[PDB]
Each structure stands twice: as C-alpha cells, then as structure tokens.
Subunit: 69 residues, 2 copies
C-alpha cells in the first residue's frame, strides 16, 4: 500500500489511423482517471502498450473485437 | 526502438512538504519529455516512486543530496 498517492501516473494522448492488426494485439485498456483525456491503451501480444483515442473508429472496431475476442 | 510509438507517458503534477526522509528515498529522476510538466520522481527504498515538483525546496535538497548520495 502507498499512503502517498502523488506518484508517477501513466497518462497519454495519441492516435493512429493505421492500427496494428488485431492478431498482434492482445487486449485494450483505458488511461488513468487522473488523465484529463480518456484514451485507450492497446496491449500487444508482445506486451507492448500503445495509446489511441477511442474517437477513432478503428479503436472502436478493435475494442469491439477484443471485447468479444 | 519502435517505428510505431506513442504510448503511456509516466507523468505527474504533485508535491509534498511533508516528504519522506532521505533514508526512505534511494534516488531521484525526471518525468518523461512527453509530459507537459517537468516533475521529479523519487524512487524509494521499496522501489516505490513518487512525484514532486522541483519548485519545492525539499525536492531541491533531496536532489542535491541524492545526486551526491
């Protein structure tokens, strides 16, 4: 437990019109609530995370695909 | 290297006047360049990081102390 919650917080704002194939992605995640902008963090099969804003339809498609698969 | 980057940025904007003693900290560090605010991340002896803006004297002293020790 950390009594002091004023620590390093993962935040991000990015997007990509050409998203990596769904076969390379493992799952999706959302940026910290501390972030002024809510973004989606895709975790690849290589466990490498990337940030993309949910307003991109590809992100929606990938989220919709990863939520069902 | 990553041809496709833009991922979670460890950022922070906080401070604490009642900071933990130098015996509780191991070292200091700076926030990522993607951060809109430069902050200092202190790494405790428990591998727990914490942030504090360098504008605080405690941070300056701890930086000056941790840079030498």
């Amino acid at each position: 437990m950390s009594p002091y919650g004023s620590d390093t917080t993962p935040c991000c704002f990015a997007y990509l019109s050409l998203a990596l194939p769904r076969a390379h992605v493992k799952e999706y995640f959302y940026t910290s609530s501390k972030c002024s902008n809510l973004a989606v963090v895709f975790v690849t099969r290589r466990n490498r995370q990337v940030c993309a804003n949910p307003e991109k339809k590809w992100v929606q498609e990938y989220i919709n695909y990863l939520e069902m698969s």
